Design a protein around this ligand. Structure first.
Ligand SMILES: CCOc1cc(C(C)(C)C)ccc1C1=N[C@@](C)(c2ccc(Cl)cc2)[C@@](C)(c2ccc(Cl)cc2)N1C(=O)N1CCN(CCCS(C)(=O)=O)CC1
Length: 85
């Protein structure tokens, strides 16, 4: 599997959620981002698949401040913009 390298901001969020390295598989990056979202309680109370970013630094990585965990292609796109090329 390919080990990717999150840029500064993204990496900071992953480490806050428990990540302890600099390179990860995309599966690991996503797992840690999910943990970050749960830790920060960014998910919507009523529609739990919805993630609110307008009040969190995670919002800096998205154009539209709300995304669904069901939007895998969109989420992969966001991460790609935050990987060392
Ligand atoms: C952060 C929220 O993530 C998810 C939330 C949901 C619910 C709550 C809407 C169903 C479903 C799937 C999830 C959920 N889907 C995952 C697998 C995923 C994997 C790849 C991609 Cl591209 C997108 C999503 C992941 C890892 C996630 C990863 C990145 C991001 Cl930005 C958000 C979530 N995620 C996750 O973190 N959890 C933790 C909480 N778990 C809670 C499981 C509870 S239960 C009763 O359904 O078993 C479920 C898995």
């Amino acid at each position: 599997e390919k080990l990717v390298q999150p840029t500064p901001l993204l990496l900071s969020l992953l480490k806050s959620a428990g990540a302890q390295k600099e390179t990860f598989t995309m599966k690991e990056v996503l797992y840690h981002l999910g943990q970050y979202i749960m830790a920060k309680q960014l998910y919507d109370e009523k529609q739990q698949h919805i993630v609110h970013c307008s009040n969190d630094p995670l919002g800096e990585l998205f154009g539209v401040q709300e995304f669904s965990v069901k939007e895998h292609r969109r989420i992969y796109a966001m991460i790609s913009r935050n990987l060392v090329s």
